[PDB]
Amino acid sequence: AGMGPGDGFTILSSKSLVLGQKLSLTQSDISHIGSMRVEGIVHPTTAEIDLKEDIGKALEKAGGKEFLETVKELRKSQGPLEVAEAAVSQSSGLAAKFVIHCHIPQWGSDKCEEQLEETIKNCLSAAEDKKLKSVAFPPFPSGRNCFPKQTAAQVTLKAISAHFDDSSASSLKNVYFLLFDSESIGIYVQEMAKLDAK
């Protein structure tokens, strides 16, 4: 019995952290981001807050004129985004309430692993600041000389645990990792196995 948060999403494997947050690896149809029953969606992007990759295009297609307008206004009012910075836009055409845009660091840059850790912590901070109960992280960008999958998964899971160890009041109860690639899924499975969970 395959089940998950909205049509297009299936939970593959989950781990429950000591203070009760649930991390769930989720088989995902990114084109169904509009149906996703998760309150916040992370949009990994650049300083310019551009709409590339499956997530950017799915948010663009679901959002319409209202979304293009909200991103344009956010660029004017808060942009450009600094490295590891997160900024929020009210959703258009989604079950989610907000899109959490973040400027992810480039692999090979000075302390990029620590900056990825800060990025993930800033996303969680942006979600909690809207009192969101759940947040979804889409696939990490995979262009030229991008972060190795094992490193990105290790760092993200470390950041998440650390954030929740440092809070006793965060509204977030569920974190989903949206994945569809068999190798990416295996990597998250291997990395989650090492956590203090269930």
Side-chain angles (χ1 to χ4, degrees), residues 25 64 88 101 105 116 179:
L25 300 184
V88 187
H101 314 263
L116 177 52
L179 299 155

Side-chain angles (χ1 to χ4, degrees), residues 15-23 164 172-174:
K15 287 295 182 223
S16 169
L17 301 184
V18 168
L19 302 164
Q21 299 85 6
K22 193 172 130 199
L23 307 192
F164 288 125
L172 289 168
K173 299 293 297 186
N174 287 280

Side-chain angles (χ1 to χ4, degrees), residues 68-140:
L68 280 182
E69 269 301 303
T70 309
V71 180
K72 179 205 81 78
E73 272 310 304
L74 180 70
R75 290 177 188 138
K76 287 165 82 178
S77 75
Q78 240 150 288
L81 289 174
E82 280 169 52
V83 178
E85 195 197 337
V88 187
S89 72
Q90 191 170 274
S91 68
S92 298
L94 320 170
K97 298 159 54 63
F98 296 95
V99 177
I100 300 145
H101 314 263
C102 63
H103 172 185
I104 59 142
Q106 287 190 106
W107 172 252
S109 62
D110 191 49
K111 308 294 176 199
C112 62
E113 290 180 42
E114 286 158 31
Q115 286 267 65
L116 177 52
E117 163 150 45
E118 290 313 300
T119 306
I120 297 309
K121 288 172 172 206
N122 291 344
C123 287
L124 295 172
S125 295
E128 296 171 337
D129 292 356
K130 294 290 184 294
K131 295 174 197 297
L132 299 180
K133 278 181 274 293
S134 59
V135 66
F137 288 85
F140 208 54

Side-chain angles (χ1 to χ4, degrees), residues 131-154:
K131 295 174 197 297
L132 299 180
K133 278 181 274 293
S134 59
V135 66
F137 288 85
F140 208 54
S142 57
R144 50 178 278 96
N145 303 124
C146 268
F147 266 85
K149 294 181 185 297
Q150 183 173 343
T151 300
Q154 200 184 342

